[PDB]
Amino acid sequence: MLRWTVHLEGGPRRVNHAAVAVGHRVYSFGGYCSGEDYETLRQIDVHIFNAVSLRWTKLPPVKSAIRGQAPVVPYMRYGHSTVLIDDTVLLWGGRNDTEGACNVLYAFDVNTHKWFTPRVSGTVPGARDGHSACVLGKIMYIFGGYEQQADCFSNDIHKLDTSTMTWTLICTKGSPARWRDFHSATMLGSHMYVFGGRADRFGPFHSNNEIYCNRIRVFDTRTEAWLDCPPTPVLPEGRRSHSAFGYNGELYIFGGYNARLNRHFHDLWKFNPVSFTWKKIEPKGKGPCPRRRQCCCIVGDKIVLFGGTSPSPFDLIDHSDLHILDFSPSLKTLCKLAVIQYNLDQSCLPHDIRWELNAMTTNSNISRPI
Amino acid sequence: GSMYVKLISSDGHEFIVKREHALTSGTIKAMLSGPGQFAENETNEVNFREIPSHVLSKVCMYFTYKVRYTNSSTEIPEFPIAPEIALELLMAANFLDC
Amino acid sequence: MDVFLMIRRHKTTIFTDAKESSTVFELKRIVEGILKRPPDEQRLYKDDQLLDDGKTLGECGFTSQTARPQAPATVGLAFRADDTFEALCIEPFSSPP
Amino acid sequence: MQIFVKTLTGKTITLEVEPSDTIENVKAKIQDKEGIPPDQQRLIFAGKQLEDGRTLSDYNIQKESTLHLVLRLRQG
């Protein structure tokens, strides 16, 4: 049973980043950090966490490909989304403090690390931050977020067919999910599950009527309709900036923040779509402190959770740490944890095991403590 | 194959466990499917010359626990590992790929 | 609901599971399939207490709360020897340092 | 006169302000007392978003009033 098995420090200190898993390596793009420069034009960042060696590395800056042409790379930003389709990360949206509005689609090849901007057509969604993004086949679905130019919350779904690089504003059927940002959207099968987010209780505009959503909303991509859903007897507290992920056919949400309660979360909730029910799950081990807008990525039966923001022990801190949630700990994993906890001498273990023990107890060198 | 298999410790204890449970170990799974393990040449038993009974008994309990609680989502007791066995149990789990 | 057991005789240990509602006799049928001795040639024990064929495991004191997979409950096993039954004897496991 | 500016979390700022001060002026005062640039600030009163051009009198903001402050969610 599920257990927090790794807690490492010294990684990128980031919140409101976006990340994808490519096999056993997590690629993390951009994000915000207090005290660092989000006004002057800089290149976005790529850090890679290897979930086997448990090491963070950072890619070097993008160089100009031809003399006289600027490097092809998104500017540093936060609040953007990243999805993976085959060998390509699609990065879209987000913002910085200064450069107003960017709705340019960026593609990043996970093998060559080259960036490019595919030529798109159709109804390009307006620039925004805090939207969700997910994929089904070659289609990327953008929902929600806070539109910069229109200055409002969105409840549109824009789909990008990457086979033709064509955007479409979906004319949906059913009752749409409330305009919101910093929600999640997770594909299970052909259905998109929208949970949480900050919203306004009367409409799409800030009006000092801010609410935190917790009624799950479901979009069927086949009929392009929002579904009427049954109530559930139990449900998580409303929150924004949780992480969501789909594992073994079920939706999981972790952490986040509710501004009405002024509460950060480190709970874990499981939504089973077949029975259509919520359950709160208690992993073994300590796990992360309550926080918001971390990223979570799935590697096999493990979740890599890293970064985010939490109240300092405005007095907020941004996180450089990383946690692994193991849904199915092997006996070897359980024994490694016991050997570490009991402080036993490791010098008579074979070197393959000692390498693993070292991996799980050694910080990376991206950051030092603040 | 047979519903049960026999795992023998270095000190000659015989542990009889469900084959499905023993397959929690990648090593045992490979042994049970080793060359010639077919028809009446199939032994249904494995001899661990280097794992003593106090370790192999705990390994078998881990098999039972893992199969029982796979996909469980309710609060369950953890798997207990005493300090005096942790190093040996770690080496056995590494050898057994479990 | 389900009780997890070690059935132990001499240097043999069978790991098996059963329902609280299953009988001692059903347990003997499991032993028979593995060790090839019929139930009438078997005596099963909870510690020193001989167990009767018709009793359920729950009626014998086993409960799912006290026979968990990671801490199975022990059932002693003795076979008929010739005229009589052998003494119940469970050989201890080895010892760690 | 004095007005109060309160974020939904609970931080409360007091501002000594003139009734003829624009919304832009109020955001500048908030930056002085807290260090928050005006472009990250959104001010709401009685459910209405306040335009940088208009002044406090234009929005009928009398004494002891509380303005609701919304900040850009850089940290989600």
Numbering used by the authors:
A (entry chain A): 1 to 313, 321 to 377
B (entry chain C): 15 to 112
C (entry chain B): 1 to 97
D (entry chain D): 1 to 76
Question: How is this structure described in the published paper?
Answer:
The largest cohort of CRL SRs recognizing terminal degrons are the four BC-box proteins in the KLHDC-family (hereafter collectively referred to as KLHDCX), KLHDC1, KLHDC2, KLHDC3, and KLHDC1031,32. These SRs all feature Kelch-type 6-bladed β-propellers that recognize C-degrons bearing terminal Gly residues.
To gain insights into the structural roles of penultimate residues within the degron sequences recognized by KLHDC3, the crystal structures of KLHDC3 bound to ubiquitin harboring Gly75Arg or Gly75Gln mutations were resolved to 2.6 and 1.9 Å resolution, respectively. The structures superimposed with the wild-type ubiquitin-KLHDC3 complex with 0.23 and 0.09 RMSD over main chain atoms, respectively. Both mutant degrons engage the KLHDC3 binding pocket in a similar manner as for wild-type ubiquitin. In particular, Asp325 forms extensive interactions with side-chain atoms from the substrate ubiquitin’s Arg or Gln. Mutation of ubiquitin’s Gly75 to the consensus degron residues Arg or Gln resulted in ~3- and ~2-fold tighter binding, respectively. For example, adjacent to the C-terminal Gly-binding site in KLHDC3, an aliphatic/acidic pocket determines preference for a Gly/C-degron’s penultimate Gln or Arg.
